[PDB]
Structures are given as structure tokens and as C-alpha cells.
Design an enzyme around this catalytic site. Structure first.
Site, PDB file in Angstrom:
ATOM      1  N   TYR B 109       0.616  -1.335   0.077  1.00  0.00           N
ATOM      2  CA  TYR B 109      -0.313  -0.140  -0.404  1.00  0.00           C
ATOM      3  C   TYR B 109       0.564   0.781  -0.019  1.00  0.00           C
ATOM      4  O   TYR B 109       1.889   1.344   0.805  1.00  0.00           O
ATOM      5  CB  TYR B 109      -1.128   0.254   1.443  1.00  0.00           C
ATOM      6  N   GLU B 197      -4.267   7.399  -3.508  1.00  0.00           N
ATOM      7  CA  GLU B 197      -3.942   6.215  -3.186  1.00  0.00           C
ATOM      8  C   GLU B 197      -3.594   4.915  -4.057  1.00  0.00           C
ATOM      9  O   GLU B 197      -4.750   4.625  -4.479  1.00  0.00           O
ATOM     10  CB  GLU B 197      -4.879   5.754  -2.137  1.00  0.00           C
TER      11      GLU B 197
END
Ligand SMILES: *SCCNC(=O)CCNC(=O)[C@H](O)C(C)(C)COP(=O)(O)OP(=O)(O)OC[C@H]1O[C@@H](n2cnc3c(N)ncnc32)[C@H](O)[C@@H]1OP(=O)(O)O
Ligand SMILES: *SCCNC(=O)CCNC(=O)[C@H](O)C(C)(C)COP(=O)(O)OP(=O)(O)OC[C@H]1O[C@@H](n2cnc3c(N)ncnc32)[C@H](O)[C@@H]1OP(=O)(O)O
Ligand SMILES: Nc1ncnc2c1ncn2[C@@H]1O[C@H](COP(=O)(O)OP(=O)(O)O)[C@@H](O)[C@H]1O
Ligand SMILES: Nc1ncnc2c1ncn2[C@@H]1O[C@H](COP(=O)(O)OP(=O)(O)O)[C@@H](O)[C@H]1O
Ligand SMILES: [Mg+2]
Ligand SMILES: [Mg+2]
EC number: 6.2.1.5
Lengths: 286, 385, 385, 286
Positions: B109, B197
Site C-alpha cells: 500500500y 492512494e
């Protein structure tokens, strides 16, 4: 009494514009010591009977002013909040709404490093009843008193002002720090200016959802605030992840809700009022 | 403002960050044809909606034949998709992304935002890829590493390596990860973004880093200097009224209750809704009246609050402003007329001529109640329901 | 696909062609603030709609004060504007262009398109600026000069000079005019355009050329290779159904009559509408069923033809195709009872199983008429009205 | 009989695809002389029992085919229409729909200069009853006859085919020239191939709105067509400035309406039929 007083001299940037004119005309009548304004390309003329200059420096020379209020369009705001700092102005009030977040982010860093003070941006306002007024607010609901108020919302202040006028009390001085997410001075910066002040007996702190300067102020209060404080937080009914008007009034990924702010503002030894109706009533208890 | 997956991947390609090969499609046929321009199967077809969690709602499937791709496109184009990040309604699927399936070895991530708290742009990385960062944050916070961009120097290669290392990568996977770091970081400052993101940032079986999904958020305040982005907004994903209200300098938001509010100023606006919940009512919306209640502006304000059938009363509350509290009452009445308002309206004024403006409303002979101050106006509307 | 005025002027800026200085605006305030970023008055405020003739409809005014600009924006944002190039409805004004007023000396016309006839891209210039070229063409054809782009060499200077001269310009006004010619010509080929129209191309008092207005048309077939353009389309200017129909491979167009048609193939579709007009009926639309009448596709086809309240009968007409004329009848019936069709439906089949399919419709018992051939189906629907 | 016949050998480009397969399978059953297909990267295999090659040249060598039918996606069409010409194919049929106008514009120029013939693009079709079929149409409504047909609309052809089958007549050969605005060969190019042909006694010309190749054909008819002609124009009820399905069926700035085409097609000595129902009936008059 903090930030300003009958002896503070002020120049306004973007003085020849609509909002610039209208709001100066008022501070002129309430009797604020506006000494002139700035608008590039129009230096050497007169506006509301005051003198207009080409640069912020030409002004700070010819008048010796120490505070500037800005009414300049977002796209150019950063360039003049900076020209101000350079000609060495020591108190900056910026009304403008809509300044890009990354602009403020850079600007703030300069603001600290050079020791200058800015209140705002995005609809702030500072008024010391009877003595001084720089802002957009109505002056007749105030009465020279002993209460200090800091608030992110502008209009919520008007409600708290009137309640304290009506209960005799009065306001020492009123500070609206602005609605954007990265303001020029936050709660702690203004909470300290009060404590160290005589004319102010107690404090009304008004916050709302989003961010965490409410929480932080809390911690700083238990530890360094002797006087008494009444607090109000707006936005319980507010939904998650949506911006409620103010650029910085948003609940991002579960952080900054209404409740936590109340809670952590309580365990700090502040008197929380859950209805902005009982603000006056709670002040009575001191 | 939000951006679509395919638009972010498109931007990524311009700054040289790696993304799979794919094509945005608006019709079954176009999607179908894309299979071969891409290569050999299999392929991933994805709905293009602003929200996330499309995966768990059956909005992202891996398929194996040209007709499975077609079938999928016919099943979604023109329909709303509901994930756990939308409301009962869902968001309309108007395009399908069809890109190449990537051999997944491990999901990471990588993301970034503006930390109001420390006043910096911050990047976060984690080994916990493929999942809500918010969970990992409260549940295992020591698993999310961060670095903060210095505003004097911009992003710097070491920062990229430090994360790269805390993530336990080694060899060429580090150079790559640094490339991506410096890239996204640049895009962040250059396109005036509010958030990024890349989840999941994958490590292929072949040992390379690749961006499989992207969420981009742009700073609305800066659109005047990001013309390219100004063009990418898709009105079809947001509430049509939100935009319809902006044109008239009104900030609107729909909730789900029965009492409408029309207040001037965001603070007082949230303040009011709270004092109505306080006395047993359900605010049905938040509406901030921007530039003084002119006759027209108030009208449209009603026109909007009342487009919701669930409303059964409207609470006006004006304090101060740039209009003599008497022309406001004048406008309110004239508004109730032109629109044809059937529910009870409770005005609450304060300021100049506030005295007589109230009378002008009690005389009017419509369903309008001049309340005496705040705590009254509250109970009065709460009552009329 | 069409583009907005402000989007064209924006593209012009990238290729260095001269345009006035201005800013696209979505709110009264933004427009109002634009005055000063521009300069000293006066300013021109223009509605941004795809159609033309905005001038004669009060959609383009020259103003003199910051508040006249505001006033204008409040009066148009959110409303539809009707020129002589739109239909009774008009097109929605969602943005105002506010640019600097230019000192006008003389108005010229410069434009270009693809001539089906000579099979070349052609540019036309004229001294008759500020007016419908079509008029000047039929009324005074000798005032429209043309040159044709060679596909072997691309645009070349001499062509630019040549027009420049027939227009009677001299001096530096020639170099300038050539620059613009070579420019637009380039943009034409590079962005895959279908049409250009700078009207009026002005000559300032100060003696310079400047584009005051632009109409751009892009070739829909080429969007796959013009990604930037793909993003500028504004769905709000076209009929929402046109687009809603494309998602299902259906070519739709609304006319204004009472008999709906659902035909497969564009030729037969226009042909059919004509044979309905021939026997006193008014076709209410043109709808071409693309990829074989599957059950679903037919449904949506009805769903659309019937969104028009004026319809009072629907004429289906399928010839050939890739579906057994019996599964079509099967679908038609389902379609009817599920959508909830009121009006009379007249099917006309031809091909395989065509005569048992007809039976399956007469047995069905709904209001469906199997017609015997073309000239019958015609009179039968024309009759049921 | 024109363009093709039982002796025309054909290869198909984009032979291994959906539409490519489906439509070849048919031409193979009607008995068309398909000798193989082309698909880059799959050479050296067999598809519908025929051989598949990597390039159009490898094909034209190993088979000696002289016509190619194209079923390749728009984005790459121009590249293979071109590849065909270079390996010296002499008859090109392109089905593909959606080829960028500027692409055709260039392609046409090459098509003339090199002396090659293309029919299409955008759903065309060519069939000589009993002998040959390359296209997407149904083969059983035709009957080997004496009428020739040229048409921009494909489906309108089917109507006119059947009417002439039902009245005994028969079709010599059917040419659908495609719907795009800039086709590879237009009316005049096909009208001439008929006149010079024995098997064709009369002609049915089918047009529609948009452009002017209908008009031009007219002029060329009065002056160089001896045989008789029946014409039909589709699109009277059609609105101005909107594209009706076909990329080239649009009325731009008042030019190319339904009516003018009829009119100017009349004064040319053609028998205009106003309802595509009376097509047969009008042919009877010869
Ligand atoms: S906070 C109360 C409620 N308001 C809101 O929520 C909205 C707040 N409004 C804004 O943020 C606007 O952006 C402000 C800044 C108030 C401006 O509105 P105006 O309508 O007054 O703006 P004008 O264009 O009319 O006037 C602006 C003047 O500023 C001059 N100027 C430009 N650049 C500079 C710099 N660097 N320094 C000084 N002045 C500058 C412009 O030239 C203009 O003056 P003119 O007389 O118009 O030339
Ligand atoms: S005209 C009748 C009614 N139709 C319409 O209105 C729509 C017409 N359809 C089209 O125009 C489509 O664009 C066509 C060309 C029919 C294609 O549809 P398909 O679904 O068959 O396309 P596929 O992707 O399935 O197959 C295409 C094959 O072509 C190969 N190919 C690519 N590039 C070339 C070149 N230069 N030369 C030869 N072949 C080429 C592809 O690789 C593909 O074959 P695969 O077996 O899929 O690899
Ligand atoms: N190109 C791809 N190749 C292989 N798997 C993919 C691809 N795109 C997505 N996936 C799989 O689908 C999952 C969800 O996709 P994602 O794009 O993250 O959608 P969302 O965030 O909306 O749920 C991924 O975590 C991954 O396992
Ligand atoms: N920037 C400008 N400066 C001066 N006059 C202008 C400007 N823009 C438009 N005009 C005037 O307005 C007329 C109409 O504008 P135009 O943009 O052509 O609108 P439309 O084509 O829709 O009628 C022009 O012919 C010109 O006289
Ligand atoms: Mg994800
Ligand atoms: Mg014009």
C-alpha cells in the site's frame, strides 16, 4: 484586549475593489485607524479620502502602519501575503476565501520563520469593542466587556456575542481564526494571548468538525490556562466524508468528529455547553 | 474533486509510472474489441465509478473469453453500482476499463495526503496491501510507515529508499520503488492534488513494481490553475443538486430527515441542524446561503430544499448579513408564493428592522411563524411535525 | 462531436494563434472577479452553448461595470438559451466566457471542412465577415475564395498568401494571415477535426488579425486517438437519450410525430419513416437496431421510443438480421407485457420462420398486428390513429 | 455480371476473428472461392480448413488470390487496406465501420494512383447470384437474373432484391458501396461497369440524403447510360444537421436533401419511384 486597539494603524491591500471598499468604509466609520491602501498600478491617488500606493513598502514608509488586511482574489493572494511580510508588516489579516491548500502550506512556514502574525485566511475577523474593527461583522451587537472569544465559524460568533451583551458581560476582544484547514494561527496561539491579558476574565472557545486543533487546544488548556473556559462544538448531525461549507470542516477517515472534540475538551476541565443557546447561562457560573 | 481510475492511470503514464495496459470503454463492442489490442487472455474488466470497494461488490472480475467481456459490459453500462462507499442509490457505470491481468506476487500500500496536524504533505507505505488502510491504522498502527515532504527541498530520493527499506524490499525493487515515490510526489505538487492512494501497489511474479489501482483527489480551490483537470470532472457521480446549488452561491448537502434548514453561514448552519436534533427533530439537509438573501437566491434555496419529498417543514434562520431583515421577510413571502410551498415555514430573524420584519410575516397570512429567538424557533418547527 | 467556444480558443492558444484574453466562468462571483484579472473595461460576456447565433438572441453583450457582469451571469447560469440554431428547448448555459473587448476595424470569415465532392480538406475565406456563410454562398458565391489541401504535401505558405491576397490585405497583415492559415490547417490534421469556423476573424484598429469566435467539430470516429478531446465532450448539450441509446448499440433521433419506428439498418429505417409519411402518418423518430434484436435490446428500444408522450402507435419492421424471426416475436411480446406498452404495435417480419413468428404474435392476444408485407404494415399503423 | 464471379479467388484479412469467421463460413458454404486468410502472428496454421498467413504477400504468393475482403477493427484498418495494395491485390472489399475520415481521404488517393479497386468501407457487399458472395447478406432471396443494383444502404438492397426475385426478373450482380462520406468507389464508377455488361438489362440505383454523388451520377447518366434506370432516395422525413445512423447520411448547411436528389435524378431521364414498394412495378415498364 489583544491583537489590536484604537492605536493600531492599518492599510488594506486590494483597497480599490468592491469588497475592499465596502468593508473599509465600515471600519472607517466604526473609527478604526485606516491610514491608506495598496493597489498596483493605481498609486498616487486617493480612495476613501485615504492615500493609495503601488507597493506595500511605499505604504509602510509613508504611513508607518503595522497591520494589513487583505481583500485580494485567491489566485494572487499568496503573492501579496508575501509582499506584506517582506515590507515588514507585523499583523496580517486575510479575508480571501479559496486559497489553494498548498499555497497556505508554504505561506505558513514563512509566517513562523519571519515572526509575523496572520489571522485567517477565509472569512476571519478581529474586533475590540469601542476601540477597533477590521473585518466584515456588524458592530452594534458588541459591548466593551470582559469575555474573550475564538472561533472557526464567523456567524456562530455573532450568536455568542449577543448572548454576552444581553447578560451584561461584554466582550474584551473577538477573534475568528478562519475556516480553511491550515490557518495562519490556531487556538493555542490565541488562547495564550488571552491568559496573559488583564481585561479578559473568561473564555468562549467555538469549534466544529474536522481536524484536531480543538483537541490540541484542550491539552494545552488543562496544563497552561488558569482562567475559565466555556466551549461549543458545531456539527454532530454532520455526515462523514463530506465538506460542510468550510473548506476545512470535513470528517476524513473517522478522525475529527463532533463528539471526540467535546469529550477531550471536557476531560480538560472546560465547561461544555451542548446547545449554543445556553452559552450565556454557562458563563454566569463565573 | 475526484478522478476515475482510468484517468489516474492515464496521468501515471505521462509521468512514466508503471500501470497495466488497458483501454477505457463506453460500449460492449468497444470493450469486446479491446481484448485483442491488449494481447492474450486473461483480462480484467472494471467498472468506472468514483467510489471504492468495487471488488467486493462484483464490479471487478477476471475473465477468459471475448464474450465474457461483452456480457459484463452489457450487464453494467447504464446501471448504478453500489459499494460499501456509496449510498442506497449507487453511482452510474458509464465506462468499463478493460486491462491486462497481472501475475500477483504480493500486494503493498502506497499513499499520501495533507496532514493538517503537522502541516506537511505525507506519504505512507505498508506491507498490508489489498485492504482498508483505516483498519490497519487503528488495529496495527506500527505497520504504516511515513515520511514528510520538506517544503524547502521537495521530495528527495533517500526518503523513497527509507520506505523502500522499511518495507523489506531489496535489489532492483528499491530503485523502482524510489522512482515511483519521486514520481507520485512530483504529481502531487504539480497537479495540486489533495490525496493519492495506489492500493494495491503490486510485486509481479517476474519481480517488478506496478500500480494496479488509483484514487486521486484534486484540490477544488486550485482548479483555476489546473485546466487539464478542470476538464476531467464527471458530474454524473455527484448529487446533481450540489452542483445546481453552486451556480447560485449556495452550499447544499442532503441528509435524510424531515426538517429543512436555510441558514446563512456554515457555522450557524451546522449549529442550527444540531439544535433541531437536540429537540427531537431530524434535519433533512444543510444549506448555507452565501451572498445575502436576495429575493431570487432565497427562492432557489427553497426550490432545492423542497425537491425532497420527505420534507415536512422548513426552518429559516438568518442572523446579520448584508440585507435589512425586512427585505428578507419580503423575499421569503414572495418566495413561498412563486414556488407554491405547502409545508410550515419558521423564520427567525435578528439584526436591523428585525422587529417589523417579523410582523410583516405574521400579517402575511401564509403558513409562516415568526419565532422569538433561537430555542423557540427550534421547538416550533419540531412541533409542526 | 462539438466543442465550446472557450475550448477552441484554448486550443488556439496552444498552437499560438491569437485570441482575446478571457476566462471561463461557472459562478457569478468568478465572472465578476475576472474583470480585473483581465484589465480595464469594457468586457464581453458570452454564454457557452454549442449552437451559434448567440449574438442575435441576447447571449453576447458588451458591458462596462463589475456588477453588470455579475447581473448577466445570474440571469443566465442554469437556464436554457434559444437561438435560431436550437430547438424550442434550447441548450443549457453552464459557463460564461468573460474576455476583453476588442477594437473592431473589419470582420472577415475564415473556415474549413471536408468536401465529399472533391475529396479534400478545403479552406474558405471571405470579406463578408459577421454573417451566415450559407447566405453569402447562394446569394454572392463570388465572394468566397477557396484552396484545397494536398494530401501529399500538407498545407503550404503560398496557399495562405493566396487567400491573403484575394482578400486584399497587404503588408504585415499578410504574414499574420499566413501564420493563422498554416496553424488552423495544422490543428485540423493533427486533431482529426471535421470542421473549423472562425467567424468573425477581425482586423483590429491597431492593425492586427485576431480570432473572435470559434466553432470546432471533431470526428467522432477518431476519438480513440484524440484522448484530450475525448474528455471535452459536454453531454449536457445533446439529447440525453441519444447517448442513452448508444450504450446499447442503438442509433436514436427524435422527430415530432405520433408513430414510432423500430427498424434494423439505417437505410430501411429512413425508408420506413418515408413510407409512413407517404400514407398520411407522422414518424415520431428514427431508431436503428444495431446488433440483432435480442430480448433485452428490443426492450430498451421500446423503453426509449415510448419516453415521448406524443407517441400513439409503434411500428416494428425487421428484415433479415442474425436472429430467427421467431425469437424476435418472442422478444417483442415479452418486451410489451414487461415495459407495459399501451399503444398498438405493428410488427412486420421477413426471413426465417417468418410466418410462424407472425402467428405467435396473433395468438399472443396483446395488441399486436402481424402485417402482410410493407405497404400493409404502413396503412395498418396509419389507421390505428 | 461485374466485379466478381465463380472464378474469383479470395483471401480474408482478419480471418481468425469473430465477424471474420462467421462471415467467411457463409461465403464458404455459398461456394465462393475462398483460398485462405491473414492474421499477423498466426501464420502457419489452418482455420476453416483453409491456410492462414502472416502477411498479405505470403498469401498472394502461395495462392495467387486477387481479391481481399477486410474484417479488421477501425484503428488498424488503414494499415491493412494499405498492406493489401502493396502486395498487389486488385480488388479490396472493406467491411469495417468507423474508419476516421482523414484516413479514408488519404487511402482513396493511393487507391486511384495505384489502379486498385476498393468497395466500401462500412458494411458494403458484393454478390453475383449462383456464382459468388463476399459480404454479410442472406443468399436465398436472390435469383440469377438481369438487373443490376447499386446502393449506399445495405438493408434497402434486400428489399429491392426480393421484389425483383418475386417478379421473375433476377439480379445480375449486387453492389453496396457503403455508407461513409468518402467511399472507395461511388455510383459513377459502378454505373459504368454495368452499361458495358451484357448480363445486365436494366438498373436500380438506391441512394439517400447527404453528399452529392447521387446528383453527379445523374449528370453522368443522361450523357453516358443507354440502359434504363429506376431510382429510389431514402430520407425525406429526415431532419437537417443530424446524422441518421450512417456516418455519411447527414444534411450539412442545406446541401444534399432528399428532394434535390430525386429532382436532379429525374431531369436526367430516370424513372423515380417514390415508395420503395413500387420498385418492382416500375421495372415492369421495361
Ligand atoms: S469572508 C465574507 C464572505 N465572503 C466569502 O465567502 C467570499 C470571499 N471573497 C473573496 O475571497 C474574494 O476573492 C475577495 C478577495 C473578497 C475579492 O472580491 P472582490 O469583488 O472585491 O474582488 P475585485 O476583483 O472586485 O477587487 C480586487 C482588487 O485587488 C486588486 N489586486 C490584484 N492583485 C493585487 C495584489 N497583489 N495586491 C493588491 N491588490 C491587488 C485588483 O486589481 C482589484 O482592484 P481593482 O480596483 O478592481 O483593479
Ligand atoms: S457491416 C455489418 C454490421 N456491423 C456493424 O455496423 C459493425 C461492423 N463491425 C466492425 O467494423 C468491427 O470493427 C469488425 C472489423 C467487424 C470487427 O469485429 P470483430 O469482433 O470480428 O473483431 P475481433 O477483434 O474479434 O477480430 C479482429 C481480428 O483482426 C486481427 N487483426 C488486427 N490487425 C490486423 C491487421 N493489420 N491485419 C490483419 N488482421 C489484423 C486481430 O488480431 C483479430 O484476430 P484475433 O483472432 O482476434 O487475433
Ligand atoms: N490488472 C489486474 N490484474 C490482476 N488482478 C487485478 C487487476 N486489477 C485488479 N485486480 C484484483 O482485483 C482486486 C480489486 O481491484 P481494485 O482495483 O483495487 O478495486 P477496488 O479498490 O475498487 O476494490 C485487486 O486487489 C486485485 O486482486
Ligand atoms: N472579444 C470581443 N470583442 C469585441 N467584439 C466582440 C467580441 N466577441 C464578440 N464580439 C462581437 O459580437 C459579435 C457576435 O459574437 P460571436 O462570438 O460571433 O457570437 P455568435 O457567433 O454566436 O453570434 C461579433 O460579430 C462581434 O461584433
Ligand atoms: Mg483498491
Ligand atoms: Mg459568429
Amino acid at each position: 484586549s489583544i491583537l489590536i486597539d484604537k492605536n493600531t494603524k492599518v492599510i488594506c491591500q486590494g483597497f480599490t475593489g468592491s469588497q475592499g471598499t465596502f468593508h473599509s468604509e465600515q471600519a472607517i466609520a466604526y473609527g478604526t485607524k485606516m491610514v491608506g491602501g495598496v493597489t498596483p498600478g493605481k498609486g498616487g491617488t486617493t480612495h476613501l479620502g485615504l492615500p493609495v500606493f503601488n507597493t506595500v513598502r511605499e505604504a509602510v514608509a509613508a504611513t508607518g502602519a503595522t497591520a494589513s488586511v487583505i481583500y485580494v482574489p485567491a489566485p494572487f493572494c499568496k503573492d501579496s501575503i508575501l509582499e506584506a511580510i517582506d515590507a515588514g508588516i507585523k499583523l496580517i489579516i486575510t479575508i480571501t476565501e479559496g486559497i489553494p491548500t498548498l499555497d497556505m502550506l508554504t505561506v505558513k512556514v514563512k509566517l513562523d520563520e519571519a515572526g509575523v502574525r496572520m489571522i485567517g485566511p477565509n472569512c476571519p475577523g478581529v474586533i475590540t469593542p469601542g476601540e477597533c474593527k477590521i473585518g466584515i461583522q456588524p458592530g452594534h451587537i458588541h459591548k466593551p466587556g470582559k469575555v474573550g472569544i475564538v472561533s472557526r465559524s464567523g456567524t456562530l460568533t455573532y450568536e455568542a456575542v449577543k448572548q454576552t451583551t444581553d447578560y451584561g458581560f461584554g466582550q474584551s476582544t473577538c477573534v475568528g481564526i478562519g475556516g480553511d484547514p491550515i490557518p495562519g494561527s490556531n487556538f493555542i496561539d490565541i488562547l495564550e494571548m488571552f491568559e496573559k491579558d488583564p481585561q479578559t476574565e473568561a473564555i468562549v472557545m467555538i469549534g466544529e468538525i474536522g481536524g484536531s486543533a480543538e483537541e490540541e487546544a484542550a491539552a494545552y488548556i488543562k496544563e497552561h490556562v488558569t482562567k475559565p473556559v466555556v466551549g461549543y462544538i458545531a456539527g454532530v448531525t454532520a455526515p462523514k466524508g463530506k465538506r460542510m461549507g468550510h473548506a476545512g470542516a470535513i470528517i476524513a477517515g473517522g478522525k475529527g468528529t463532533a463528539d471526540e472534540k467535546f469529550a477531550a475538551l471536557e476531560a480538560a476541565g472546560v465547561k461544555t455547553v451542548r446547545s449554543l443557546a445556553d452559552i450565556g447561562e454557562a458563563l454566569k457560573t463565573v | 474533486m475526484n478522478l476515475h481510475e482510468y484517468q489516474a492511470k492515464q496521468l501515471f503514464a505521462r509521468y512514466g509510472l508503471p500501470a497495466p495496459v488497458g483501454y477505457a470503454c463506453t460500449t460492449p463492442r468497444e470493450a469486446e474489441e479491446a481484448a485483442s489490442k491488449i494481447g492474450a487472455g486473461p483480462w480484467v474488466v472494471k467498472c468506472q465509478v468514483h467510489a471504492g470497494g468495487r471488488g467486493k461488490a462484483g464490479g471487478v472480475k477476471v475473465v477468459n473469453s471475448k464474450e465474457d467481456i461483452r456480457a459484463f459490459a452489457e450487464n453494467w453500462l447504464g446501471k448504478r453500482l453500489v459499494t460499501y462507499q456509496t449510498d442506497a442509490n449507487g453511482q452510474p457505470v458509464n465506462q468499463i476499463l478493460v486491462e491486462a491481468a497481472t501475475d500477483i506476487a504480493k500486494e503493498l500500500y502506497l499513499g499520501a495526503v495533507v496532514d493538517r496536524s503537522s502541516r506537511r504533505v505525507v506519504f505512507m507505505a505498508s506491507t498490508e496491501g489489498g485492504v482498508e488502510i483505516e483498519k490497519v491504522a487503528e488495529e496495527t498502527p506500527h505497520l504504516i510507515h511515513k515520511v514528510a515532504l520538506d517544503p524547502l527541498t521537495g521530495p528527495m530520493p533517500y526518503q523513497g529508499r527509507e520506505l523502500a527499506f522499511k518495507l523489506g524490499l531489496e535489489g532492483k525493487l528499491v530503485q523502482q520503488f524510489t522512482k515511483i515515490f519521486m514520481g507520485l510526489a512530483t504529481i502531487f505538487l504539480e497537479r495540486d492534488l489533495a490525496l493519492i492512494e495506489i492500493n494495491p501497489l503490486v510485486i509481479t511474479k517476474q519481480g517488478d513494481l506496478i500500480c494496479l489501482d488509483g484514487k486521486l483527489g484534486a484540490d477544488g480551490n486550485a482548479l483555476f490553475r489546473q485546466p487539464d483537470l478542470r476538464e476531467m470532472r464527471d458530474q454524473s457521480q455527484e448529487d446533481p443538486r450540489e452542483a445546481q446549488a453552486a451556480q447560485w452561491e449556495l452550499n447544499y448537502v442532503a441528509l435524510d430527515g424531515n426538517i429543512g434548514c436555510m441558514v446563512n453561514g456554515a457555522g450557524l448552519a451546522m449549529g442550527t441542524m444540531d439544535i433541531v436534533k437536540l429537540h427531537g427533530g431530524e434535519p433533512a439537509n444543510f444549506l448555507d446561503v452565501g451572498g445575502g438573501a436576495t429575493k431570487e437566491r432565497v427562492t432557489e434555496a427553497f426550490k432545492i430544499i423542497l425537491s425532497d419529498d420527505k420534507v415536512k417543514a422548513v426552518l429559516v434562520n438568518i442572523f446579520g448579513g448584508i440585507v435589512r431583515c425586512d427585505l428578507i421577510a419580503d423575499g421569503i413571502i414572495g418566495a413561498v408564493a412563486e414556488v407554491g410551498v405547502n409545508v410550515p415555514v419558521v423564520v427567525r430573524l435578528e439584526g436591523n428592522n428585525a422587529e417589523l420584519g417579523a410582523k410583516k410575516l405574521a400579517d402575511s397570512g401564509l403558513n409562516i411563524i415568526a419565532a422569538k429567538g433561537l430555542t423557540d424557533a427550534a421547538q416550533q418547527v419540531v412541533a409542526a411535525v
